[PDB]
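Regression test attached.
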Amino acid sequence: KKRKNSKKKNQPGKYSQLVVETIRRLGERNGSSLAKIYTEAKKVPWFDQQNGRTYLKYSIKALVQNDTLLQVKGTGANGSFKLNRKKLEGGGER
DNA sequence: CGTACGTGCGTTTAAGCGGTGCTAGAGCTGTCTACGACCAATTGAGCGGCCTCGGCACCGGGATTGTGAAAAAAAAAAGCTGCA
Ligand SMILES: [Ca+2]
Ligand SMILES: [Ca+2]
Ligand SMILES: [Ca+2]
């Protein structure tokens, strides 16, 4: 349907998935923080201890831009990120 | 319940050792006089004694500040549902 419309929607990577799973899994409040999600994110056996935190940082920055996720205050530290996916297109928009 | 610490490995580092070589500077000696003790005479700073009057302790009255109770809202929290 037209040009740059009805697009691929490439499935996110295992860390970007873990960020979303973890945010919903313990999410019933006004925001889930970077440091919070990291705390039991690393409980997962395949999680790369040395870099994982940085991967989760890449994910959250991209998920917010995607409009998959949204920040309650979300500048640098604390941030707090609620999945804003609920009331949206869900299919992508420019 | 989360992870900071303790353990134990293999790998890396530089302390420790014994030695040599060089000389700064610690420390000793001898000399000589500037400086401090000691003294006697002089006298004025600082002592005790004494008097006074204004600060400050104490009081009463009023202004002000902070606390706690009760009632009522805002909010998290909890237990309760069917679905999916
Ligand atoms: Ca702790
Ligand atoms: Ca000397
Ligand atoms: Ca006096």
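Expected vs. actual: identical. The two ends of chain A are 14 Å apart (CA to CA).
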